[PDB]
Amino acid sequence: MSESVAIIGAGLVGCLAALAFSKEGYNVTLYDFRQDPRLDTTKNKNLKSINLAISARGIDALKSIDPDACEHILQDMIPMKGRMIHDLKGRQESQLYGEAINSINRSVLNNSLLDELEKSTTELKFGHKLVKIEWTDDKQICHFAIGTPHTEKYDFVIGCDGAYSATRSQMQRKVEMDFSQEYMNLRYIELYIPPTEEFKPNYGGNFAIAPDHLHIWPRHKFMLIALANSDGSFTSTFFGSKDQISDLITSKSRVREFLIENFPDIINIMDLDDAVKRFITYPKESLVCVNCKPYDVPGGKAILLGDAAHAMVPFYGQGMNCGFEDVRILMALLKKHSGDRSRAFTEYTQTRHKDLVSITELAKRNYKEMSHDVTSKRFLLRK
Numbered sequence: 001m002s003e004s005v006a007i008i009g010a011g012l013v014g015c016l017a018a019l020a021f022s023k024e025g026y027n028v029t030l031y032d033f034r035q036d037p038r039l040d041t042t043k044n045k046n047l048k049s050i051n052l053a054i055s056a057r058g059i060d061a062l063k064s065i066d067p068d069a070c071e072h073i074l075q076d077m078i079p080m081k082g083r084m085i086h087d088l089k090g091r092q093e094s095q096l097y098g099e100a101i102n103s104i105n106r107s108v109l110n111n112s113l114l115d116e117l118e119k120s121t122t123e124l125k126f127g128h129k130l131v132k133i134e135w136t137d138d139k140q141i142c143h144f145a146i147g148t149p150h151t152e153k154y155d156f157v158i159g160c161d162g163a164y165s166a167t168r169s170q171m172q173r174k175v176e177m178d179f180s181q182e183y184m185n186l187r188y189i190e191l192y193i194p195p196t197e198e199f200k201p202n203y204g205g206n207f208a209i210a211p212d213h214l215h216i217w218p219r220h221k222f223m224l225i226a227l228a229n230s231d232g233s234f235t236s237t238f239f240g241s242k243d244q245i246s247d248l249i250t251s252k253s254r255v256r257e258f259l260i261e262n263f264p265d266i267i268n269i270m271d272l273d274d275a276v277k278r279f280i281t282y283p284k285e286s287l288v289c290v291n292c293k294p295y296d297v298p299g300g301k302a303i304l305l306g307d308a309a310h311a312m313v314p315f316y317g318q319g320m321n322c323g324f325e326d327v328r329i330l331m332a333l334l335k336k337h338s339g340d341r342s343r344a345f346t347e348y349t350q351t352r353h354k355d356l357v358s359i360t361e362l363a364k365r366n367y368k369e370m371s372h373d374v375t376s377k378r379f380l381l382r383k
């Protein structure tokens with residue numbers, strides 16, 4: 001009397017979809033080939049950044065799915081009431097916020113959603129790697145690579161397996177899918193701003209700089225940002241071109257001089273010798289942009305959410321927020337159609353694709369104003 005569902009991917013989007021589906025009564029199994037991140041045996045926690053910005057909407061999405069833990073999950077998240085722009089003279093300026101934004105720890109949020117799933121019907125399959133799907137007109141046979149095979153069968157499948165979605169590949173045999181993938185020159189380095197030693201009254205904690213703002217040091221074709229953490233430290237990220245970075249990392253002192261010159265107001269609060277070490281032992285990461293049409297196999301057999309459907313630019317686009325919104329849109333559609341996945345999924349591709357071609361235009365307009373169009377003397381160096 002209940003339909004069963006396979007969810008491929010236990011990242012932020014995958015879990016949230018598992019929650020929203022248990023909550024509706026479906027029989028959720030959730031797979032990931034990586035190990036349970038909650039076990040410290042796992043070295044690789046698949047953590048792209050230490051923390052993220054979760055918008056009003058992403059909170060609203062997570063709310064409608066798990067109204068309960070939406071507050072024993074979003075506890076320590078820090079609300080940032082605007083941006084703080086840092087010019088080259090270290091001068092810093094508050095620009096208040098249409099939609100608000102909060103700093104939340106990624107590994108924590110990913111782990112909290114996992115826990116919430118144990119308090120529900122959902123079975124969790126870690127160490128399982130989806131490798132093939134056969135498409136019948138009733139139940140879909142999924143094959144896995146543990147450890148060496150295994151299979152299983154399901155009324156329908158959800159691909160939540162990120163940017164190189166195996167589920168997307170399998171779907172591409174069954175459907176004519178417009179597909180595009182682009183690799184950007186954009187690279188990112190993770191830096192760190194330690195907590196001050198003493199409690200700072202004006203900031204409500206051990207924060208070197210204002211924790212209720214998203215700190216941006218906008219330069220020409222590159223950028224430094226910072227977001228507060230609960231302990232007083234800031235997760236900091238450097239974004240620039242692959243070519244800029246690779247010309248820099250050849251000379252240990254070069255990187256150093258680059259930093260001091262472009263971000264003078266961060267030497268006091270950051271450990272510079274280690275900042276250089278971070279830049280050079282920086283792990284190459286492909287950044288891919290992907291698009292998909294449609295998001296689903298006809299007759300409600302399968303669907304794509306998260307990066308699997310639409311991997312966008314870090315920072316300028318908001319992946320996680322969008323994946324969360326995906327789930328909310330999907331469920332609301334399943335209700336309007338009373339459980340008809342075939343008529344729901346179909347409308348999902350219709351309306352989501354409208355949304356997400358406009359969304360990947362506000363991530364270019366955002367690339368434009370903040371990063372490409374930087375020429376003024378306050379944000380650009382003259383030797």
Ligand SMILES: Cc1cc2nc3c(=O)[nH]c(=O)nc-3n(C[C@H](O)[C@H](O)[C@H](O)COP(=O)(O)OP(=O)(O)OC[C@H]3O[C@@H](n4cnc5c(N)ncnc54)[C@H](O)[C@@H]3O)c2cc1C
Pocket residue numbers: 008009010011012013014031032033034046048049051052053054128129130131160161162163164165166167188305306307308312314315317318319320321322323
């Ligand atoms: C540096 C950086 C900062 C970012 N900051 C923000 C931000 O502030 N706000 C925001 O909204 N977005 C941000 N994003 C984008 C955001 O991180 C992603 O869009 C989001 O994590 C997508 O999650 P996902 O669950 O869809 O996919 P993923 O995080 O990629 O998770 C998919 C899971 O599927 C698993 N998997 C893959 N293949 C298989 C297989 N076939 N079988 C089983 N499992 C499989 C993977 O192991 C993975 O755990 C940022 C991205 C980066 C790189």
